Design a protein around this ligand. Sequence first.
Ligand SMILES: *[C@@H]1O[C@H](CO)[C@@H](O[C@@H]2O[C@H](CO)[C@@H](O[C@@H]3O[C@H](CO)[C@@H](O)[C@H](O)[C@@H]3O)[C@H](O)[C@H]2NC(C)=O)[C@H](O)[C@H]1NC(C)=O
Lengths: 49, 48
Amino acid sequence: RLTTLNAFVAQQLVRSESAALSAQLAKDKVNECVKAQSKRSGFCGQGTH
Amino acid sequence: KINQALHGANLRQDDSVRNLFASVKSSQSSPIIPGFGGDFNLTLLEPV
Ligand SMILES: *[C@@H]1O[C@H](CO)[C@@H](O[C@@H]2O[C@H](CO)[C@@H](O[C@@H]3O[C@H](CO)[C@@H](O)[C@H](O)[C@@H]3O)[C@H](O)[C@H]2NC(C)=O)[C@H](O)[C@H]1NC(C)=O
């Protein structure tokens, strides 16, 4: 049980840092190609966004 | 369970690779011709 919970804490740390990096990426979209018409074709909108 | 998990991982990584194949595909392009670039010796880039 304690080994299972240790692995659970490990994957929770994994998903926590993944969610943190994903939040950084998400604010990168909302500051990059959402509030502005950037030239990131296919990065967030496919074709000429 | 780990077999269907790795099957799922393989299928989604194949999904990602043909997303980037759709990304790299142009709407229009030109066929590559030998002697391209004029004097530019790009023959290593030539796919023959
Ligand atoms: C553009 O670059 C390529 C590669 O850098 C050149 O490829 C050349 O291809 C010829 C044909 O096989 C090679 O010639 C050989 O030369 C040896 C002596 O060097 C000779 O004994 C062989 O019978 C054969 O003729 C040549 O080595 C090769 N060059 C290199 C650097 O690999 C190509 O010629 C270049 N084109 C232009 C317009 O500069």
